[PDB]
Ligand SMILES: [Cl-]
């Protein structure tokens with residue numbers, strides 16, 4: 525019945541295997557089954573109650589490799605299971621879910637900065653390429669609003685981006701929308717109360733604490749209250765009508781801070797500290813694990 529905030533993987537000196545679940549009510553962190561492979565720069569999402577870990581990169585003292593992997597965690601068994609991999613490795617990926625399908629957007633593979641996009645069908649365990657973005661985007665933020673897919677910011681290999689573009693599944697076409705006020709790579713992007721939020725990131729000079737919100741009806745981005753802590757490569761999710769931001773990098777430290785945005789008051793507050801600081805996590809929300 526209760527839902528937890530799951531954080532998977534991340535980076536602190538090397539990529540991490542942690543899966544931990546935060547209970548915003550009783551404050552606990554539950555330590556769950558490790559990822560099969562340590563990964564940073566991955567994304568998390570939930571479909572049908574199952575948690576998915578998508579893409580990323582294994583930075584290890586034995587060597588570094590970008591990842592095409594898709595893996596699925598079932599809270600009712602506390603077990604990970606592999607899925608079919610993506611067509612290419614995608615480090616610093618963004619993902620969104622439309623109609624029960626997972627869209628993997630952008631990211632990098634070595635020196636390749638992807639504009640390509642592909643779609644996963646859980647009911648067939650198959651990926652299929654769809655139309656590529658207008659822009660190559662690593663560290664791209666992704667959100668779904670009214671069954672359209674939005675790709676926000678990122679880094680094209682040369683320039684960091686304030687542009688955003690919108691994918692129409694029925695047309696299989698990408699269209700540019702209004703750009704953000706601020707250039708951001710590695711921002712946290714999510715949807716809350718029918719608006720897209722973009723929090724934090726890196727503009728090529730500073731890590732950011734500013735937060736802006738996109739309203740489709742007006743096609744305008746508007747600043748809201750900034751986070752307490754500047755952070756790039758943060759994890760973000762929505763739980764019970766509030767945004768949570770987890771970890772990240774502030775130019776000096778890998779943060780363990782978790783901040784929570786209340787839209788009704790337009791206020792951020794620090795609510796917990798992760799068990800260790802890290803950046804580049806995948807985050808999503810689903811039902812708590814079966815006690816056993
Ligand atoms: Cl590509």
Ligand SMILES: [Cl-]
Nearest residue numbers: 527763764809
């Ligand atoms: Cl919820």
Ligand SMILES: [Cl-]
Nearest residue numbers: 567568806807
């Ligand atoms: Cl994520």
Ligand code: NA
Nearest residue numbers: 541559560562
């Ligand atoms: Na592992």
Ligand code: NA
Nearest residue numbers: 567568569619
């Ligand atoms: Na995500």
Ligand code: NA
Nearest residue numbers: 593594607609
């Ligand atoms: Na896989």
Ligand code: NA
Nearest residue numbers: 645648650652
């Ligand atoms: Na298929």
Ligand code: NA
Nearest residue numbers: 709710726756
């Ligand atoms: Na960044």
Ligand code: NA
Nearest residue numbers: 739744745746
């Ligand atoms: Na707005």
